[PDB]
Enzyme design. Sequence first.
Site, short mmCIF file in Angstrom:
data_model
loop_
_atom_site.label_atom_id
_atom_site.label_comp_id
_atom_site.label_asym_id
_atom_site.label_seq_id
_atom_site.Cartn_x
_atom_site.Cartn_y
_atom_site.Cartn_z
N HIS B 41 -29.86 -32.43 -58.65
CA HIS B 41 -29.75 -33.72 -59.38
C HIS B 41 -28.45 -33.79 -60.15
CE1 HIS B 41 -31.17 -31.32 -62.82
NE2 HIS B 41 -30.36 -32.14 -63.48
N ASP B 86 -35.18 -29.54 -55.75
CA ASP B 86 -34.02 -29.89 -56.52
C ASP B 86 -32.98 -28.76 -56.48
OD1 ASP B 86 -32.17 -30.99 -58.27
OD2 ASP B 86 -33.48 -30.81 -59.98
N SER B 182 -29.52 -27.48 -66.60
CA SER B 182 -29.98 -27.43 -65.21
C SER B 182 -29.01 -26.69 -64.35
CB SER B 182 -30.09 -28.83 -64.61
OG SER B 182 -30.31 -29.80 -65.60
#
Lengths: 4, 231
Positions: B41, B86, B182
């Site tokens: 993402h 992801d 992330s």
Amino acid sequence: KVPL
Amino acid sequence: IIGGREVIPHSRPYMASLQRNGSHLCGGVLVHPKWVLTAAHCLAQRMAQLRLVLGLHTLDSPGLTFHIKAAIQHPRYKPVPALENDLALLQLDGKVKPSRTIRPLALPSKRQVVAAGTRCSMAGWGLTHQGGRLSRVLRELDLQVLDTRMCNNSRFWNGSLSPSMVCLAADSKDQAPCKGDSGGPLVCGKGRVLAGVLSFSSRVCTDIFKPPVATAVAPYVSWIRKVTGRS
């Protein structure tokens, strides 16, 4: 869901 | 990382910072001399202006900087509201010779299971306060793996965490990875083993009814292999  | 502690400079040589015009966006882990594994993402982006910086502690300092030759998203990647699979694999426009400050983290075996109760950590340069600014320095946090049936509880992730996702908890109410974190590698166990890659939370980083969640590496080791060409 807040994607980081 | 909100409520983490500074790492010993260069104690985690596998950390990447994926940046856009020298501004940091996400971590990433270096899983091979030419590849950094991050979250998909993170790449919702104009690639021309993107860079991987390796070997860092202070975020504004040189470090080894690479252009990306290809950003490969997991084929079955679904963005929000799904946010499934992801992962993305970033190819370096050079090749890393291991050194003391830059070095790849090994992949886990495909059969690796991350059982609840597992002691892990997670490094990142992300936000250190809700609404705040990114960290000046690479930090870390201790994370315990929670049980998925239990994170799927209606008051928590309400059913939506799949088998490939590792649900997580700090020791305290007030510690959580956060914007910018992330792509950061979750490492677990005594031997500090690659186990996951951070993915998402809710908007308030420390929301106790929305524990942070990462993607297990093991179930995607095979693809990582095919893509990176090695076996």
